[PDB]
Amino acid sequence: AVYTLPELPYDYSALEPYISGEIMELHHDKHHKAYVDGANTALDKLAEARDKADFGAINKLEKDLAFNLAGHVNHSVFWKNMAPKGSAPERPTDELGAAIDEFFGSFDNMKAQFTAAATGIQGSGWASLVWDPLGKRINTLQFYDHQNNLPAGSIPLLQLDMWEHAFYLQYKNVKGDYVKSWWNVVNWDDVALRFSEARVA
Amino acid sequence: AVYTLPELPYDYSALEPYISGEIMELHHDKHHKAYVDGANTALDKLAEARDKADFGAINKLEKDLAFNLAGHVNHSVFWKNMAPKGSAPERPTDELGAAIDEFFGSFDNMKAQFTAAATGIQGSGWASLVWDPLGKRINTLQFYDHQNNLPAGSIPLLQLDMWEHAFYLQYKNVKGDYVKSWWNVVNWDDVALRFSEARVA
Amino acid sequence: AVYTLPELPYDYSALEPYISGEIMELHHDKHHKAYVDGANTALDKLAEARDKADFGAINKLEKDLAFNLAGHVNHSVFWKNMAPKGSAPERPTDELGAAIDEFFGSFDNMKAQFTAAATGIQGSGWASLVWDPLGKRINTLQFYDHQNNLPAGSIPLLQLDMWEHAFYLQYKNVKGDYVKSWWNVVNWDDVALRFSEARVA
Amino acid sequence: AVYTLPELPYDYSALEPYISGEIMELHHDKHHKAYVDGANTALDKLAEARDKADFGAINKLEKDLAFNLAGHVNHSVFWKNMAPKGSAPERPTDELGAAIDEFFGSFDNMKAQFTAAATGIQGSGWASLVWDPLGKRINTLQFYDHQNNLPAGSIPLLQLDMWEHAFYLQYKNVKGDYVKSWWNVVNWDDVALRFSEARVA
Ligand SMILES: [Fe+3]
Ligand SMILES: [Fe+3]
Ligand SMILES: [Fe+3]
Ligand SMILES: [Fe+3]
Numbered sequence: 001a002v003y004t005l006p007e008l009p010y011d012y013s014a015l016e017p018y019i020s021g022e023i024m025e026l027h028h029d030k031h032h033k034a035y036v037d038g039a040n041t042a043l044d045k046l047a048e049a050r051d052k053a054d055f056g057a058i059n060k061l062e063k064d065l066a067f068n069l070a071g072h073v074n075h076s077v078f079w080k081n082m083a084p085k086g087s088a089p090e091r092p093t094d095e096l097g098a099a100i101d102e103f104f105g106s107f108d109n110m111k112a113q114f115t116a117a118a119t120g121i122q123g124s125g126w127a128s129l130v131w132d133p134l135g136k137r138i139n140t141l142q143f144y145d146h147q148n149n150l151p152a153g154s155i156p157l158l159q160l161d162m163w164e165h166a167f168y169l170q171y172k173n174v175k176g177d178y179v180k181s182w183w184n185v186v187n188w189d190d191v192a193l194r195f196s197e198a199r200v201a
Numbered sequence: 202a203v204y205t206l207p208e209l210p211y212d213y214s215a216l217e218p219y220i221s222g223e224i225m226e227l228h229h230d231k232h233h234k235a236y237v238d239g240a241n242t243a244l245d246k247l248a249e250a251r252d253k254a255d256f257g258a259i260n261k262l263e264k265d266l267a268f269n270l271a272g273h274v275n276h277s278v279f280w281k282n283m284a285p286k287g288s289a290p291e292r293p294t295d296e297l298g299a300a301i302d303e304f305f306g307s308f309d310n311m312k313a314q315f316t317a318a319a320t321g322i323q324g325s326g327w328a329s330l331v332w333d334p335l336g337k338r339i340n341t342l343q344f345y346d347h348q349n350n351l352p353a354g355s356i357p358l359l360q361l362d363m364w365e366h367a368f369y370l371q372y373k374n375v376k377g378d379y380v381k382s383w384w385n386v387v388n389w390d391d392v393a394l395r396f397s398e399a400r401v402a
Numbered sequence: 403a404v405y406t407l408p409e410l411p412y413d414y415s416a417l418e419p420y421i422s423g424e425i426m427e428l429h430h431d432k433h434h435k436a437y438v439d440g441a442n443t444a445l446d447k448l449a450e451a452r453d454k455a456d457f458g459a460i461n462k463l464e465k466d467l468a469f470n471l472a473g474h475v476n477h478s479v480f481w482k483n484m485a486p487k488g489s490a491p492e493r494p495t496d497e498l499g500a501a502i503d504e505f506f507g508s509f510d511n512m513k514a515q516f517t518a519a520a521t522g523i524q525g526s527g528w529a530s531l532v533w534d535p536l537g538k539r540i541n542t543l544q545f546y547d548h549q550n551n552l553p554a555g556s557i558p559l560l561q562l563d564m565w566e567h568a569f570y571l572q573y574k575n576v577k578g579d580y581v582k583s584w585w586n587v588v589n590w591d592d593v594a595l596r597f598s599e600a601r602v603a
Numbered sequence: 604a605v606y607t608l609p610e611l612p613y614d615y616s617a618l619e620p621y622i623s624g625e626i627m628e629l630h631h632d633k634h635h636k637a638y639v640d641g642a643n644t645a646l647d648k649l650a651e652a653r654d655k656a657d658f659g660a661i662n663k664l665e666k667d668l669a670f671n672l673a674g675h676v677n678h679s680v681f682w683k684n685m686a687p688k689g690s691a692p693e694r695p696t697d698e699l700g701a702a703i704d705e706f707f708g709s710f711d712n713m714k715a716q717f718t719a720a721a722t723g724i725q726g727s728g729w730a731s732l733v734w735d736p737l738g739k740r741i742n743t744l745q746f747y748d749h750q751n752n753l754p755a756g757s758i759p760l761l762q763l764d765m766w767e768h769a770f771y772l773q774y775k776n777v778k779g780d781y782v783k784s785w786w787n788v789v790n791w792d793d794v795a796l797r798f799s800e801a802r803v804a
Pocket of ligand 2 (some may be wrong): 230232276362364366367
């Protein structure tokens with residue numbers, strides 16, 4: 001297949017007590033899998049459309065592709081953006097640390113803005129720290145669903161899933177507690193790597 | 202400031218009779234300029250939100266940034282994606298040509314899918330040929346407005362503005378004639394350059 | 403103020419085993435309450451904008467109003483659309499029954515279309531049976547979030563909340579089981595009343 | 604057919620010099636017609652879906668229905684909301700006038716809010732004065748495209764088409780001039796009638 005479901009870089013319960021293993025299992029094995037299957041299906045139907053010269057469902061297929069592929073991209077980044085507490089730095093350092101200071105003033109300012117963007121979403125969405133190639137800077141974006149409210153070319157550095165399935169079983173309606181806990185498992189090494197590769201294509 | 206209005210790489214009337222100089226002037230001098238100002242303003246507002254430590258308008262600011270920055274990105278690519286009729290090959294060649302045949306079967310198949318995506322938009326939008334870094338392939342996407350219906354990380358290679366201001370004064374409601382005429386001014390050399398740089402990340 | 407949180411017309415656990423009392427409490431006391439407060443706040447903000455004669459945040463305020471008021475409307479109908487198992491007929495009768503057969507062919511056909519609309523949503527949303535005043539017919543609509551994908555003037559007759567918070571704690575990712583169980587608690591008497599009042603405008 | 608294209612209640616050039624007859628002709632004969640045809644088609648495909656028990660394209664069909672029907676509803680109201688200058692009151696009076704004063708403070712405040720909502724739209728959209736049945740009041744809403752950003756049950760009283768095709772040929776990018784001119788042709792008698800019938804189902 002074109003798209004494949006990546007394995008978690010750690011055990012399902014490795015992020016506890018911050019993120020329950022029950023959520024990690026359903027989230028990865030069920031939800032992420034659906035997006036991979038959906039993205040592959042969209043490509044197959046588009047191929048069939050070209051073959052038969054029948055583009056009647058083009059609007060449906062283009063949304064299916066965007067929604068599912070965006071879901072696949074977002075979650076693939078999401079898994080790697082996390083690591084068990086103690087297995088990675090508690091704060092960004094070196095180049096990444098300096099860059100965050102440059103575009104946000106301080107790490108605390110970045111956290112406050114990222115958190116506000118995460119908890120204020122009206123509907124399903126993502127809080128995202130991205131590299132803007134046309135501006136050469138790091139900005140925060142608030143995705144709607146998976147594929148809305150973002151410029152083309154945006155390179156994801158750090159992302160937080162704010163869809164209810166990502167926190168409801170453990171935190172219920174208190175999304176704030178979820179975000180506070182989540183900061184404890186952010187793998188700053190992964191973010192730093194993405195940054196190094198992002199600012200150069 | 203952070204974002205600037207790029208100048209056109211050709212005269213305003215260089216794309217005639219395909220696209221009128223009148224549209225080119227309004228589109229570039231009025232419309233594109235507004236997105237640059239809007240994107241800069243969004244960043245300024247976000248900075249002020251950080252200083253005052255008040256993110257009450259975070260939802261508005263993130264949408265202002267996404268909408269305006271996406272408008273800026275989309276039009277910047279759009280201008281370079283075109284060139285006077287005989288200034289570039291009417292058909293893709295070399296690496297780009299082979300890539301199109303690989304992912305679409307043929308150039309004609311690609312044109313058919315791109316055209317269908319462009320003319321079927323329900324509202325304002327864009328037809329886009331992008332490089333998918335995850336699947337390592339070229340896909341067509343149908344953007345809604347400027348910032349919706351696309352996966353993060355999508356690298357724009359070729360884009361067509363389907364907002365009414367882009368064709369109404371010349372083609373009125375007949376979107377089909379606009380798209381047909383547009384193919385004549387596509388700068389495949391620019392698209393090839395974007396493909397080369399995107400493929401190496 | 404202008405909007406108030408309506409009380410449930412039954413006990414929190416009256417819809418068990420179909421919908422857990424735990425979900426009913428969180429859904430009504432926490433989620434619905436937030437939309438009431440948000441809708442009232444949006445109106446207050448708009449009034450202040452009028453006094454100060456500054457509409458700089460008009461885009462944010464109009465979305466806050468639409469999102470929150472739609473959330474309030476949708477849930478208000480939702481609560482009344484349900485009732486304890488044997489408190490109402492398991493199948494529509496009289497005028498409503500005839501109307502369903504007229505616009506859908508049969509009750510089963512209506513259920514099939516409504517269910518497909520409910521389970522196929524890409525993101526948060528609602529499956530809705532509405533009265534179309536213009537066409538004078540009953541149609542099914544698929545709302546995105548609370549306020550998108552619907553014509554103005556649509557009168558809600560029967561609605562099903564497909565946001566993850568509505569079923570996740572009990573049914574997890576299996577949307578299908580949630581919808582199947584929900585049909586057992588539909589209050590057709592409430593739906594019939596809404597139809598009668600909507601048809602006479 | 605279920606939906607039909609209503610005729611204009613006046614000549615195509617009756618609204619000049621405020622709105623050109625050239626725009627009125629394309630807008631009504633071409634654009635509005637497309638929405639009626641689209642709405643009818645959506646219903647036919649939904650009927651076919653139920654017959655064959657094939658709801659694979661349900662997401663596409665529900666959006667096609669919402670987009671086209673909303674477009675039909677919005678324009679049907681739009682045509683009647685206008686009348687040649689001098690043929691109707693320059694201001695709202697009696698019940699409507701008092702209601703506007705009640706929910707906006709004054710006619711001037713309502714105009715300022717409505718205008719701000721009209722010119723600030725990010726993408727295609729509508730500025731709308733609606734009757735809120737769950738609140739018993741008149742509010743202003745900002746529709747995105749035709750079917751987004753509005754609560755179910757909203758009854759349109761006065762609407763302004765802010766899609767570029769509605770003003771571009773005459774006003775180009777200056778949407779402000781279009782809105783200023785438009786106020787001269789508002790048929791307050793039509794709005795008053797809709798209000799009388801709206802506040803009572
Ligand atoms: Fe998720
Ligand atoms: Fe444009
Ligand atoms: Fe809900
Ligand atoms: Fe229109």
